[PDB]
Design a binder for this molecule. Structure first.
Ligand SMILES: *C/C=C(C)/C=C/C=C(C)/C=C/C1=C(C)CCCC1(C)C
Length: 133
């Protein structure tokens, strides 16, 4: 399925520390962030996505249209400018964030009632799994 609508509660989070370190997120922020349960709310209408990731400590909102390049300033993360593009490869939603960091982006897909999110930066891969609330 390409339908990723839902309120998604984080079930697991593998190597978030490595990914954040590759992004140059400071030590203290990384230590807080690795322990937190995230909720990812996705509102998807055709090719329009509105997403909100929340935790007790920090939130991050990003909206995008599939197939439309957009400028991103990663405020509240690593505070960089990237040129972002989100597209479909089969039923995998693929984001490439072009800029200073190599191999920067993510892949998101559904597999039997779980949402999988693989975040990449440099040589690091973070693997997250969510379940619908
Ligand atoms: C569709 C999947 C998306 C938009 C993935 C979003 C991932 C985040 C918003 C993660 C954000 C964070 C970090 C990268 C490190 C600091 C903690 C967070 C949760 C603000």
């Amino acid at each position: 399925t390409r339908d990723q609508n839902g309120t998604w509660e984080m079930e697991s989070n593998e190597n978030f520390e490595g990914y954040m370190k590759a992004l140059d997120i400071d030590f203290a922020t990384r230590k807080i962030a690795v322990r937190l349960t995230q909720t990812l709310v996705i509102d998807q209408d055709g090719d329009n996505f509105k997403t909100k990731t929340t935790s007790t400590f920090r939130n991050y909102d990003v909206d995008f249209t599939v197939g439309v390049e957009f400028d991103e300033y990663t405020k509240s993360l690593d505070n960089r400018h990237v040129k972002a593009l989100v597209t479909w490869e089969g039923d995998v939603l693929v984001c490439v964030q072009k800029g200073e960091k190599e191999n920067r982006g993510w892949k998101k897909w559904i597999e039997g009632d779980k949402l999988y999110l693989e975040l990449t930066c440099g040589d690091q891969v973070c693997r997250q799994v969510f379940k619908k609330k």
